[PDB]
Amino acid sequence: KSFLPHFIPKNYSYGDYPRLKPENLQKRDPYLKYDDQANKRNFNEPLHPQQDDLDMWAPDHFDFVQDSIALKWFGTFFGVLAVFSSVIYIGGLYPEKPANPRNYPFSGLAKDLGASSEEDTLLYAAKIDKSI
């Protein structure tokens, strides 16, 4: 069922500060009546030293599955898509280009693409239409 968030210490010794079991106030029963109904807290109830990580204003904690199991599924999902992508690449099953890619006249539109002379023709031209 529920479990505490990460980085919540099991023990602490802050002098004479009371030592209480760390409780996530987000998991408390909402149908009960509290002095502070919004935060699910009664007046003068002691606070954990890291209560800011275990209250309503803390990030919402998800406890449907364990993080290791949740990360196993997350890697498995993208692992399937990775194998599916690599097989088609290594196998080379993706279709070939039906025709020669588009060609353009005037030395592959070199002058219209910022070229200055014949030295910089290949630096700016597109695929040159060799068949005039």
Binding site: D112, L113, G114, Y124
Partner: protein, 90 residues
């Protein structure tokens, strides 16, 4: 009225003369701001050329774009401390 820069070079003054040194620092700074003004005017030509040319901006504004990219690395404020405290000849 429009006061003009008192052209003075660090290479023709004595730094012990605080007035001559002050003019050399001011003269170098004022020439650097003229380069920035020139750069902004040249960029205005590039902006106007790009809009009116449309798909022809590569050809119509080729020389202007080349000029802007060459002037950009050095058409900026560089200060006077660098040249005042250093002798390039040595």
């Amino acid at each position: 009225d429009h006061v003009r820069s008192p052209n003075v070079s660090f290479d023709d003054i004595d730094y012990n003369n605080s007035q001559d040194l002050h003019n050399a620092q001011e003269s170098l700074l004022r020439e650097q701001w003229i380069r920035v003004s020139a750069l902004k005017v040249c960029r205005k030509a590039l902006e106007s050329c790009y809009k009116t040319s449309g798909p022809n901006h590569y050809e119509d504004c080729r020389e202007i774009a080349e000029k802007y990219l060459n002037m950009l690395p050095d058409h900026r404020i560089q200060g006077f401390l660098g040249y005042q405290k250093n002798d390039p000849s040595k």
